[PDB]
Design a protein around this ligand. Structure first.
Ligand SMILES: *[C@@H]1O[C@H](CO)[C@@H](O[C@@H]2O[C@H](CO)[C@@H](O[C@H]3O[C@H](CO[C@H]4O[C@H](CO)[C@@H](O)[C@H](O)[C@@H]4O)[C@@H](O)[C@H](O[C@H]4O[C@H](CO)[C@@H](O)[C@H](O)[C@@H]4O)[C@@H]3O)[C@H](O)[C@H]2NC(C)=O)[C@H](O)[C@H]1NC(C)=O
Ligand SMILES: *[C@@H]1O[C@H](CO)[C@@H](O[C@@H]2O[C@H](CO)[C@@H](O[C@@H]3O[C@H](CO[C@H]4O[C@H](CO)[C@@H](O)[C@H](O)[C@@H]4O)[C@@H](O)[C@H](O)[C@@H]3O)[C@H](O)[C@H]2NC(C)=O)[C@H](O)[C@H]1NC(C)=O
Ligand SMILES: *[C@@H]1O[C@H](CO)[C@@H](O[C@@H]2O[C@H](CO)[C@@H](O[C@@H]3O[C@H](CO)[C@@H](O)[C@H](O)[C@@H]3O)[C@H](O)[C@H]2NC(C)=O)[C@H](O)[C@H]1NC(C)=O
Ligand SMILES: *[C@@H]1O[C@H](CO)[C@@H](O[C@@H]2O[C@H](CO)[C@@H](O)[C@H](O)[C@H]2NC(C)=O)[C@H](O)[C@H]1NC(C)=O
Lengths: 48, 71
């Protein structure tokens, strides 16, 4: 979301998703431990 | 995350960054590097799950104080 507030600052997408999870109130370890499952689910949803 | 003693440490609030030689944890909106301690981070799981984890030591604030008396 940084490019919406100022100059775009790069960040690995996994870490960005960790920030989002922190945002919705879920500790980032959840994402860092279920990254592959989450990626599979996201890709499947896009295909659907 | 960071691998210290077979455990994975994640930042409580902030992000792990390195200037090229050492590792620090800083708040996400202002570069304020700090030594990675057991207070900045919390443990979860082990080392063989996170993709991209990196070896690094984590400094325990209580350890040096206790060793001082023992010494
Ligand atoms: C990423 O950040 C790291 C921060 O630690 C960098 O490592 C640090 O680099 C600095 C600069 O070289 C080192 O600082 C001074 O180290 C020696 C002695 O170390 C003592 O002082 C340090 C102050 O930073 C403490 O951190 C140490 O624990 C120790 O108590 C100094 O002698 C050097 O020169 C200074 O002193 C002489 C004599 O008075 C003066 O003439 C100089 O002008 C200067 O004032 C260093 O300044 C620091 O030791 C070092 N810390 C660690 C853990 O490695 C790292 O370089 C950086 N990496 C990149 C790529 O940027
Ligand atoms: C949380 O939700 C997730 C998605 O619903 C669950 O992930 C699923 O868990 C099962 C069991 O581990 C996975 O199946 C494994 O891998 C393959 C998948 O192909 C088979 O898929 C179904 C079962 O899901 C099976 O009925 C089919 O016949 C296929 O053979 C198979 O080798 C095995 O079934 C194996 O069990 C799913 O693939 C996996 N889904 C995704 C998108 O990853 C998760 O288990 C739920 N629970 C937890 C704690 O996370
Ligand atoms: C984080 O720290 C540990 C070391 O403390 C690293 O684990 C070590 O990785 C090497 C391989 O790169 C292992 O060496 C060899 O491993 C094979 C695996 O079967 C083994 O059969 C050999 O005998 C040899 O030991 C080493 O064992 C392993 N050490 C431990 C204690 O597990 C790890 O790689 C570091 N993480 C990163 C990203 O560097
Ligand atoms: C960095 O991205 C990659 C995938 O490219 C992972 O390691 C790289 O793998 C390729 C193939 O060996 C090499 O060309 C790169 O030199 C490797 N390092 C890179 C691209 O930085 C690696 O898992 C990723 N690192 C992290 C922390 O996620």
């Amino acid at each position: 979301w940084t490019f919406g507030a100022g100059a775009a600052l790069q960040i690995p997408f996994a870490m960005q998703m960790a920030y989002r999870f922190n945002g919705i109130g879920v500790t980032q370890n959840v994402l860092y431990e279920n990254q592959k499952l989450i990626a599979n689910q996201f890709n499947s949803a896009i295909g659907k | 995350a960071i691998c210290h003693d077979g455990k994975a440490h994640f930042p409580r609030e902030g992000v792990f960054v390195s200037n090229g030689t050492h590792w620090f944890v800083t708040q996400r909106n202002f570069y304020e590097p700090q030594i990675i301690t057991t207070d900045n981070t919390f443990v979860s799981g082990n080392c063989d799950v996170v993709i991209g984890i990196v070896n690094n030591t984590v400094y325990d604030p209580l350890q040096p104080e206790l060793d001082s008396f023992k010494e």
